[PDB]
RNA sequence: AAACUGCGAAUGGCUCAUUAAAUCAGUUAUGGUUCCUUUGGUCGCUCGACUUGGAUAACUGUGGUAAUUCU
RNA sequence: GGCGGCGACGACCCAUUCGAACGUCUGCCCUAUCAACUUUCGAUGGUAGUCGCCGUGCCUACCAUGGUGACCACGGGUGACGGGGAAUCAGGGUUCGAUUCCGGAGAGGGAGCCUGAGAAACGGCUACCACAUCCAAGGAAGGCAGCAGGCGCGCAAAU
RNA sequence: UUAAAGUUGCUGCAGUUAAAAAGCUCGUAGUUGGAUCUUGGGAGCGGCCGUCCCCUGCUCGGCGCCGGCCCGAAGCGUUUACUUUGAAAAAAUUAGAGUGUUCAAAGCAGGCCGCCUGGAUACCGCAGCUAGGAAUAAUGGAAUAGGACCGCGGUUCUAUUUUGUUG
């Protein structure tokens, strides 16, 4: 399930080759997991604690920090891997005609494999990060399901 | 611009530099120092507009390098030296000292002080650092790196330093019930007591300050200077004690002074 | 207004844009074809030199001939016909001589009984026709 | 970047009706009664009176 | 005076050709980096000569090219 | 013979001051006789590197076919530097903003670079073309959209 | 080029005959969408009413006392637009306070006989940050009960203050 590509995937905080007294069983083969509290009142989920995925851009198990703006949006498409596009619908005001117009500005955010219970239409919130790609700047902090989907 | 700017236009100057328009094209850009450009005051501006000791830009230079003016116990020979909040300035020969405190409006004010009060200076700690061989460090709001401080000095406290030895004598803790004043913004020079301190994670932590007569206002965390422990101030406050008289009471006071003067 | 809704401003703005575009003065003042076909090139005055002095009659109700002059412009070589303004000024203007020619006062259209022409001569040989009229200055020769 | 003033304003206004009987009679009566030179003076007095009246009206339309 | 060394010439001044989410304006962040000068700190913390070397200026003298803030 | 006071200069590091630079959210004139655009000549994302003061297809090697669009993408035009602002104005608006303060761009126009903390600098350098100066004909020397001034262009602008 | 232009019409134009309802119908994007959810009461003043207070739950403590009460607080409380306040929002310029540049455009000066001053204030569309209310408009709770609540019954990983000193 893991180690797909031409290089080893590891978390460069822990040491995965500690020498035990025996190197047998009963205390070994449970590797430690690196995680941190991202702050701003957000709570880390269990999937980032007991998971086995390896990332370098995950807000929980990764080398990226959260600072700046906190936004929200609705998930539109899940086609490209490990990152999704959300839609922000907002209203614009004109001084001349005292009437509003709705506008949308879709943009790409990053989805770690910690949140894999995501379908089209789920409301997510994002936080500003350093540029992780050409057009990707935001990391998803939590996921909220839409109406229905009771299964 | 391929490099740093070296000129400064007259109408691009800050308003608290308190200049005129139809005098010259340029304004005195201060040399880099402890204080920022928009929050300091050049020595030429003070000596040529406030104290009226000099009239031109050469007389200020003659007085400045004549070794007559001492800045926080050190003689300075730069005519555009940045002087900011509670910069103790001394004239040794005529025996006068001035303390720079913001008055009831948004500006500086001349304030003659006794020499016994001119020996020390209240200043605000900015951040706490740890040195090379486990030495704690303090960074002060006028960039005074002090080695080995008191263990009870926190991030937003105020320390009192003797100008002859550079060490800490006494301190004020950041807590509600202490006399405070604001340095910057719409509020400036008002003296009040801290009551509330609202914590916002990831942004500016606003506080609430009540005046001694019944007025209240809210400023940011960076716009805080603690000056007293309770009601008694540790320094000599200027005239009016920083009460921020409104325009009606100011008009009434000016009319009363005009009627009494005749 | 017809479409009155709280979230309707783009439709109103686009319809106002289209109906403002479908005009006469705004369509003339915001298209380049009129200024390309403008001999003056969107300017108040222009210089030129005289080809010849011709004569054109008036319209049906008024019976007289109005003595305009044929001057081509210097900016782009457009050959136009300019009306010599006041009485007896055709003696002062000469063939192959520089003139300053301006409009006649209807934003580029014929005025009254004169046909087609829309410009008038103001100065000839860098002296005004008013000074040659009122006996205040004499032309060089 | 010369250091000059570049601040000026017009102190008088011209009415939109140039030829009316009663208006010209009223300004001629004012000028001949009070010995003024031209109509620019009474126009500028009308301008400053209109400014004062506009300021008083703007203060009156604000709440007590 | 000359000349070597060091510093400044990247500031100021003029113009609007390019540029239609590009520039710019308000609001944020560098927990994603460099910073002349000034200011403050550090500058006997390291366990291993009572002052060393040769090159060039300026200078002297001698030259080329019709000609250079040339050599 | 050892031993002292106040300075000037220079110096690794650390913070500060002046900043610069890359990013986040929102906001630009007209046009459908421009309805689909980009895409192994990087377009979208993932892995690992090179380089850069740092993040990043900025660039390499490998993967998947992604990304924007009738809520106007893309393409074209602009007599478009942007803003603080100016004129008119009952209330709403319309037009202008080359122009003294702020930010950006250029020094004929592209391209490359030394020095320096900071320059792709032009009152620094190096080659191309357009144009052009002196000459014993071998060569040598430059870019007033700086201040005055001159020609051209012009309705139109000074010592 | 602006007003006059209610001849661009969002405020605020017209479409039988003066210019102008597609020949008719379905239909996607857009725009607009019915009723319905906490009413009413008390301590009192002026004499039923225009102003006053009351009808979200829980782990640590200072304003007071004799393990027992109130007050506060490290920390959480369905989300939007709208609305009021607060921060910040360069100057000049626009209103605007003071001031006999001989008035005014100006300018930030000046007045008493060394002394006293001023060099304010408002505005700064929208977007981002905050604090009282939820009337107005749109979403969601449970119907296959994978609904709340109450005390019980089984499966696991980890905390020093202890089974006489120490292993």
From Swiss-Prot, chain A:
The modification N6-acetyllysine is found at residues 36, 43, 56. PROSITE patterns: RIBOSOMAL_S17. One of its GO terms (biological process) is translation. GO terms for molecular function: rRNA binding; structural constituent of ribosome. Its main location: cytoplasm. SUPFAM superfamilies: Nucleic acid-binding proteins (SSF50249). It holds the Pfam family Ribosomal_S17_N. The modification Citrulline is found at residue 20. Citrullinated by PADI4. InterPro entries: NA-bd_OB-fold (IPR012340), Ribosomal_uS17 (IPR000266), Ribosomal_uS17_arc/euk (IPR028333), Ribosomal_uS17_CS (IPR019979), Ribosomal_uS17_N (IPR032440). A lipid is attached at residue 58 (S-palmitoyl cysteine). The modification Phosphoserine is found at residues 65, 108. It is found in: Cytoplasm; Nucleus, Nucleolus. It comes from the Eukaryota. The modification Omega-N-methylarginine is found at residue 67. Keywords: Acetylation, Citrullination, Cytoplasm, Lipoprotein, Methylation, Nucleus, Palmitate, Phosphoprotein, Ribonucleoprotein, Ribosomal protein, RNA-binding, rRNA-binding. One of its GO terms (cellular component) is cytosolic ribosome. PANTHER family: 40S RIBOSOMAL PROTEIN S11 FAMILY MEMBER, SMALL RIBOSOMAL SUBUNIT PROTEIN US17. Component of the small ribosomal subunit. The ribosome is a large ribonucleoprotein complex responsible for the synthesis of proteins in the cell. Part of the small subunit (SSU) processome, first precursor of the small eukaryotic ribosomal subunit. During the assembly of the SSU processome in the nucleolus, many ribosome biogenesis factors, an RNA chaperone and ribosomal proteins associate with the nascent pre-rRNA and work in concert to generate RNA folding, modifications, rearrangements and cleavage as well as targeted degradation of pre-ribosomal RNA by the RNA exosome. This is Small ribosomal subunit protein uS17.
From Swiss-Prot, chain B:
The keyword Ubl conjugation applies. GO terms for biological process: translation. Its main location: cytoplasm. Residues 41-103 form the S4 RNA-binding domain. GO terms for cellular component: cytosolic ribosome; cytosolic small ribosomal subunit; nucleolus. There is a cross-link at residue 229 (Glycyl lysine isopeptide (Lys-Gly) (interchain with G-Cter in SUMO2)). It comes from the Eukaryota. The modification N6-acetyllysine is found at residue 232. InterPro entries: KOW, Rib_uL2_dom2, Ribosomal_eS4, Ribosomal_eS4_C, Ribosomal_eS4_central_region, Ribosomal_eS4_central_sf, Ribosomal_eS4_KOW, Ribosomal_eS4_N. It is found in: Cytoplasm; Nucleus, Nucleolus. The keyword Transcription does not apply. Pfam families: 40S_S4_C (PF16121), KOW (PF00467), Ribosomal_S4e (PF00900), RS4NT (PF08071). GO terms for molecular function: rRNA binding; structural constituent of ribosome. Keywords: Acetylation, Cytoplasm, Isopeptide bond, Nucleus, Ribonucleoprotein, Ribosomal protein, RNA-binding, rRNA-binding, Ubl conjugation. HAMAP family: Ribosomal_eS4. Belongs to the eukaryotic ribosomal protein eS4 family. Component of the small ribosomal subunit. Part of the small subunit (SSU) processome, composed of more than 70 proteins and the RNA chaperone small nucleolar RNA (snoRNA) U3. Identified in a IGF2BP1-dependent mRNP granule complex containing untranslated mRNAs. This is Small ribosomal subunit protein eS4.
From Swiss-Prot, chain C:
Its main location: cytoplasm. GO terms for cellular component: cytosolic ribosome; nucleolus; rough endoplasmic reticulum; small ribosomal subunit. The modification N6-succinyllysine is found at residue 53. GO terms for molecular function: structural constituent of ribosome. Residues 1-19 have a biased composition (Basic residues). One of its GO terms (biological process) is translation. Residues 1-25 are annotated as: Disordered. The modification N6-acetyllysine is found at residue 134. Hydroxylation at Pro-61 affects translation termination efficiency. The modification 3-hydroxyproline is found at residue 61. It is found in: Cytoplasm, Cytosol; Cytoplasm; Rough endoplasmic reticulum; Nucleus, Nucleolus. InterPro entries: NA-bd_OB-fold, Ribosomal_uS12, Ribosomal_uS12_euk/arc. Pfam families: Ribosom_S12_S23. SUPFAM superfamilies: Nucleic acid-binding proteins. Keywords: Acetylation, Cytoplasm, Endoplasmic reticulum, Hydroxylation, Isopeptide bond, Nucleus, Ribonucleoprotein, Ribosomal protein, Ubl conjugation. There is a cross-link at residue 36 (Glycyl lysine isopeptide (Lys-Gly) (interchain with G-Cter in SUMO2)). Component of the 40S small ribosomal subunit. Part of the small subunit (SSU) processome, composed of more than 70 proteins and the RNA chaperone small nucleolar RNA (snoRNA) U3. Belongs to the universal ribosomal protein uS12 family. PANTHER family: 30S RIBOSOMAL PROTEIN S12 FAMILY MEMBER (PTHR11652). This is Small ribosomal subunit protein uS12. It comes from Oryctolagus cuniculus (Rabbit). The gene is RPS23.
UniProtKB/Swiss-Prot annotation, chain D:
GO terms for biological process: ribosomal small subunit biogenesis; translation. It is found in: Cytoplasm; Nucleus, Nucleolus. Keywords: Acetylation, Cytoplasm, Isopeptide bond, Nucleus, Phosphoprotein, Ribonucleoprotein, Ribosomal protein, RNA-binding, rRNA-binding, Ubl conjugation. The keyword Lipid biosynthesis does not apply. Coiled coil: none annotated. The keyword RNA-binding applies. Transmembrane segments: none annotated. It comes from the Eukaryota. Belongs to the universal ribosomal protein uS4 family. Component of the small ribosomal subunit. The ribosome is a large ribonucleoprotein complex responsible for the synthesis of proteins in the cell. Part of the small subunit (SSU) processome, first precursor of the small eukaryotic ribosomal subunit. During the assembly of the SSU processome in the nucleolus, many ribosome biogenesis factors, an RNA chaperone and ribosomal proteins associate with the nascent pre-rRNA and work in concert to generate RNA folding, modifications, rearrangements and cleavage as well as targeted degradation of pre-ribosomal RNA by the RNA exosome. This is Small ribosomal subunit protein uS4. The gene is RPS9.
């Amino acid at each position: 399930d893991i180690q797909t590509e031409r290089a080893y995937q590891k978390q460069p905080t822990i040491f995965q080759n500690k020498k035990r007294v025996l190197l047998g069983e009963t205390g070994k083969e449970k590797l430690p997991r690196y995680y941190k509290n991202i702050g701003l009142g957000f709570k880390t989920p269990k999937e980032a604690i007991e998971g086995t995925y390896i990332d370098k851009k995950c807000p929980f198990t990764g080398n990226v920090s959260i600072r700046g703006r906190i936004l929200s949006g609705v998930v539109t498409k899940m086609k490209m891997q490990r990152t999704i596009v959300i839609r922000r619908d907002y209203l614009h005001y004109i001084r001349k005609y005292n009437r509003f117009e709705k506008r949308h500005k879709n943009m790409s955010v990053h989805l770690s494999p910690c949140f894999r219970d995501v379908q089209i239409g789920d409301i997510v919130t994002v936080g500003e990060c350093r540029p992780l790609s050409k057009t990707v700047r935001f990391n998803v902090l939590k996921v909220t399901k839409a109406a229905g989907t009771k299964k | 611009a391929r490099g740093p700017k070296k000129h400064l236009k007259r109408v691009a100057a800050p308003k608290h530099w308190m200049l005129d328009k139809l005098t010259g094209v340029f304004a005195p850009r201060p040399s880099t120092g402890p204080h920022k450009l928009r929050e300091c005051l050049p020595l030429i501006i003070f000596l040529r507009n406030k104290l009226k000791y000099a009239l031109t830009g050469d007389e200020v230079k003659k007085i400045c390098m004549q070794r007559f003016i001492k800045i926080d116990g050190k003689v300075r020979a730069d005519i555009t030296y940045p002087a900011g909040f509670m910069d103790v300035i001394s004239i040794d020969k005529t025996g006068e000292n001035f303390r720079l405190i913001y008055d009831t409006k948004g500006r500086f004010a001349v304030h003659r002080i006794t020499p016994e009060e001119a020996k020390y200076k209240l200043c605000k700690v900015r951040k706490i650092f740890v040195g090379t061989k486990g030495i704690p460090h303090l960074v002060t709001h006028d960039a005074r790196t002090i080695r080995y401080p008191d263990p009870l000095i926190k991030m937003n406290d105020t320390i009192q330093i003797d100008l002859e030895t550079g060490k800490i004598t006494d301190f004020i803790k950041f807590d509600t019930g202490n006399l405070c004043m604001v340095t910057g913004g719409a509020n400036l020079g008002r003296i009040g007591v801290i009551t509330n301190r609202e914590r916002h994670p990831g942004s500016f932590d606003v506080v609430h300050v009540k005046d001694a007569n019944g007025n209240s206002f809210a400023t940011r965390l960076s716009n805080i200077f603690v000056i007293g422990k309770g009601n008694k101030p540790w320094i000599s406050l200027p005239r009016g004690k920083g009460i921020r008289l409104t325009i009606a009471e100011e008009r009434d006071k000016r009319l009363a002074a005009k009627q009494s003067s005749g | 207004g017809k479409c009155r809704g709280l979230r309707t401003a783009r439709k109103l703005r686009s319809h106002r844009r289209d109906q403002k575009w479908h005009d006469k003065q705004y369509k003339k003042a915001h298209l380049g074809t009129a200024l390309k076909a403008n001999p003056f090139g969107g300017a108040s005055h222009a210089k030129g030199i005289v080809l010849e002095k011709v004569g054109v009659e008036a319209k049906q109700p008024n019976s007289a001939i109005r003595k305009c002059v044929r001057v081509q412009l210097i900016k782009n070589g457009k050959k136009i016909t300019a009306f010599v303004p006041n009485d007896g000024c055709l003696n002062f203007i000469e063939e192959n001589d520089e003139v300053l020619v301006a409009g006649f006062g209807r934003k580029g259209h014929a005025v009254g009984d004169i046909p087609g022409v829309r410009f008038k001569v103001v100065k000839v040989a860098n002296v005004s026709l008013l000074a040659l009229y009122k006996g205040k200055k004499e032309r060089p020769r | 970047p010369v250091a000059r003033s570049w601040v000026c304003r017009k102190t008088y206004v011209t009415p939109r009706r140039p030829f009316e009987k009663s208006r010209l009679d009223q300004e001629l009566k004012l000028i001949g009664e009070y010995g003024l030179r031209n109509k620019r003076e009474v126009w500028r007095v009308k301008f400053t009176l209109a400014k004062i009246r506009k300021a008083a009206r703007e203060l009156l339309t604000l709440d007590e």
